[PDB]
Amino acid sequence: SLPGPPGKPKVLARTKGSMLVSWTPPLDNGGSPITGYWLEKREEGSPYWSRVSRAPITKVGLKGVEFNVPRLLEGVKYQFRAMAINAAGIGPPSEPSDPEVAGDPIF
Ligand SMILES: [Cl-]
């Protein structure tokens, strides 16, 4: 009924204050269409997971569903996890992304 976990998110772009995060839809949507996703972040120095958007994320980019996470702090290390939403509710989280630091990218 609930959807399965989305794929492990990947950071596709970063700046000092943002990261473009992308993930694949779950293999099992639970039997009803997924209507959107929640994305949460966790930083170094805190155990908590925090939603990064006020409304569900739906944008499909080149590699998966994606969102540019704002309000990151330069030099801080973050991970992200995504949850799918369907008619039954919010599914379990993806595996967390590999850690990434907010900073500008290697040229
Ligand atoms: Cl980089």
Numbering used by the authors: 3 to 109
Publication passage describing the model:
Titin is a protein expressed in the skeletal and cardiac, or striated, muscle of vertebrates that plays various roles in muscle structure and function. Encoded by the gene TTN, titin spans half a sarcomere (the basic contractile unit of muscle) and has various functions including preventing sarcomere over-extension (Gautel and Djinović-Carugo, 2016), acting as a molecular ruler for thick filament formation and as a hub for numerous signalling molecules (Kruger and Linke, 2011, Linke and Hamdani, 2014). Fn3 domains are only found in the A-band region of titin, where they are arranged with Ig domains in a pattern termed super-repeats, which themselves are repeated. Fn3 domains have a characteristic beta sandwich fold, with a core of hydrophobic residues as the “filling” between two beta sheets that pack against each other face-to-face.
Fn3-3 and Fn3-11 are found in the non-repetitive region of A-band titin near the tip of the thick filament, Fn3-20 is in the second D-zone super-repeat and Fn3-49, Fn3-56, Fn3-85 and Fn3-90 are located in the 1st, 2nd, 6th and 7th C-zone super-repeats, respectively. Fn3-20 is at position 6 of the D-zone super-repeat, and Fn3-49, Fn3-56, Fn3-85 and Fn3-90 are at the 11th, 10th, 6th and 2nd position of the C-zone super-repeat, respectively. Alignment of their primary sequences show an insert in Fn3-20 extending the loop connecting strands C'/D to E by five residues that does not align with residues in any other titin Fn3 domain. The extended loop in Fn3-20 results in a unique protrusion from the back “side” of the domain, not present in the other structures presented here, nor any other titin Fn3 domain structurally determined. All domains determined present a typical Fn3 domain fold, with the extended loop connecting strands C’/D and E in Fn3-20 being the largest difference between the structures. With this extended loop only present in one further domain (Fn3-25), this could be a candidate for a (semi-) unique binding site on a titin Fn3 domain for a putative ligand, analogous to the “KTLE loop” in Ig-159 (A169) required for MuRF1 binding to titin. The structures increase the coverage of titin’s primary sequence with experimentally determined high resolution structural information by ∼ 15% and nearly double the coverage of A-band titin, with the first experimental structure from the D-zone (Fn3-20). The variant in Fn3-20, Leu18237Pro, was identified in a patient also carrying two C-terminal truncating variants inherited in trans, whilst Val22232Glu in Fn3-49 was co-inherited in trans with a truncating variant in the kinase domain at the A-band / M−band junction. Fn3-20 Leu18237Pro was solubly expressed but caused a 16.9 °C reduction in domain thermal stability.
